[PDB]
């Protein structure tokens, strides 16, 4: 879409094309009450003024490409748990109790949200724009043709099939956003179960500390069970939990690893079974003292 505008003498004035005047923004959201297929109903909504209206039009022209990429990839490429699209919505089911919806909102077309995912969407599409216009492609030796560096290293430093396939990845916009949404959901439920346990039973204490460096796919905690006044003596149960995209990994202070799942009954029974052993180790560590 050529984006030509035109400028005319009045002190000065501009003329933007139609289809590009208003204000349009994307919106992603997670809920639980499933919606009807009733897609048609409802509607969604000191510098030179030419600066303001020009950049508003550039923003509108950007938000169209993102949704065109997402909506073509919804229908053209197969996945698991398929998708539906009518005009301006995408509806999806990562987990049997997670519905996310993506929606383009525009104001030339009228007759609770996760800001992180909307912010990340622009960066995904811009980093997709870069790699046809960057230094990696240029070849330092004058004789050599154009092409990515690693894929000319792969000749005289004999790479093999795994490295090659790890170097040519074709992953799309919906994939990564679904994955980030999943990890956010799973992390929030793990936090809620730990905190409900901490608030409901007070026979042994339970304490959690979260990490400080974090990613879009993983996270970690340290959980520690101690008695109210004996924190120095009896401290022999301590867990490192590592939360991924749909699993949980648990490492225990004595060389033992378990792998949970995205259901919270498993994790709610694990901690309880450990709070059952704390009391015996507590009596041992005081029978020494």
């Amino acid at each position: 879409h050529h984006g030509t505008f035109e400028v005319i003498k009045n002190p000065l004035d501009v003329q933007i094309p139609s289809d590009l005047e208003g204000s349009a923004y994307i919106k992603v959201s997670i809920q639980k009450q499933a919606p009807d297929i009733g897609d048609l109903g409802t509607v969604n909504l000191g510098s030179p003024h030419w600066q303001t209206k020009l950049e508003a039009a550039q923003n509108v022209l950007l938000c169209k490409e993102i949704f065109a990429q997402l909506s073509r990839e919804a229908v053209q490429i197969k996945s698991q748990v398929p998708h539906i699209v009518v005009k301006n919505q995408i509806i999806s089911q990562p987990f049997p109790s997670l519905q996310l919806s993506i929606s383009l909102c525009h104001s030339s077309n009228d007759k609770d949200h996760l800001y992180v995912l909307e912010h990340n969407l622009h960066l995904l599409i811009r980093e997709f724009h870069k790699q046809t216009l960057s230094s990696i492609m240029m070849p330092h030796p004058a004789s050599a043709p154009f092409g990515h560096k690693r894929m000319r290293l792969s000749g005289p430093q004999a790479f093999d099939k795994n490295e090659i396939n790890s170097l040519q990845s074709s992953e799309g916009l919906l994939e990564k956003i679904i994955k980030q949404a999943k990890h956010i959901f799973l992390r929030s439920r793990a936090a809620a179960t730990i905190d409900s346990l901490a608030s409901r039973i007070e026979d042994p204490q339970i304490q959690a500390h979260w990490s400080n460096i974090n990613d879009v796919y993983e996270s970690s905690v340290k959980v520690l069970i101690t008695s109210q006044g004996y924190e120095q003596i009896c401290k022999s149960i301590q867990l490192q939990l590592n939360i991924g995209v749909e699993q949980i990994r648990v490492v225990h202070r004595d060389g033992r690893v378990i792998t949970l799942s995205y259901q919270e009954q498993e994790l709610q029974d694990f901690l309880l079974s450990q709070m059952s052993q704390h009391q015996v180790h507590a009596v041992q560590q005081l029978a020494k003292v």
Partner: protein
């Protein structure tokens, strides 16, 4: 860069100066008492020097354009860095909003 604009507007000044001084000369050569004939020569010299330096500057400018003209649209631009900076500003704004909200809930707990 800007020097080019400055010289062009100075040339505008000298254009109107040449018109003014020519009008002055022809004031002098109607009055019976045209005594300041040395100064009549002065105003003739003003006419002369003005016209030549004006035409000199414009001819030089045309030659300079004849060495810098190529007839193509010059498709460089600076859009990416501007998107990146706008992203960073709204990230800071998000931060400021969440901070104010925490502030008010702490404010209301400290007060009972």
């Amino acid at each position: 860069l800007a020097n080019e604009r400055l010289r062009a507007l100075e040339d505008i000044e000298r254009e109107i100066g040449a018109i003014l001084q020519n009008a002055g000369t022809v004031i002098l050569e109607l009055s019976k008492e045209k005594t300041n004939e040395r100064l009549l020569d002065r105003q003739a010299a003003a006419f002369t020097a003005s016209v030549q330096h004006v035409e000199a500057e414009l001819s030089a400018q045309i030659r300079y354009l004849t060495q810098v003209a190529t007839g193509q649209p010059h498709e460089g631009s600076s859009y990416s860095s501007r998107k990146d900076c706008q992203m960073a500003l709204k990230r800071v704004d998000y931060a400021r909003l969440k901070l104010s909200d925490v502030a008010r809930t702490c404010e209301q707990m400290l007060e009972n």
